[PDB]
Amino acid sequence: NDHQDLREITKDSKMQKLALAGFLKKIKGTYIESLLKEHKLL
């Protein structure tokens, strides 16, 4: 079900918006941001 190539973005879209929303919050909550910016992913 992971890695979408099917153009039927219904399950995917919701899981992406929830992934992004939650992640964007926890960026300033956890060391994840620290890792990203140290590795220049940010």
Amino acid in the structure at residue 24: L
Q: How was this structure determined?
A: NMR
d(CA 26, CA 8): 29
Structure tokens at 1: 């079900």
What distance in Å separates the CA atoms of residue 28 and residue 31, rounded to the nearest whole number? 8
Picking from 25, 28, 4, the residue whose alpha carbon sits closest to that of residue 15 is 4
**Long-range Cβ pairs for the range 3-10 (8 Å, 24+):** none
Residues 25 and 42: their CA atoms lie apart, in Å, by 15
Taking Cα atoms as reference points, which of 36, 12, 13 lies closest to residue 24? 36
Q: Is 3 helix (H, G, I), strand (E, B) or coil?
A: coil
- The rounded distance, in Å, linking the Cα atoms of 33 and 27 is 5
**Cα angle at 25 between 22 and 30, to 5 degrees?**
100
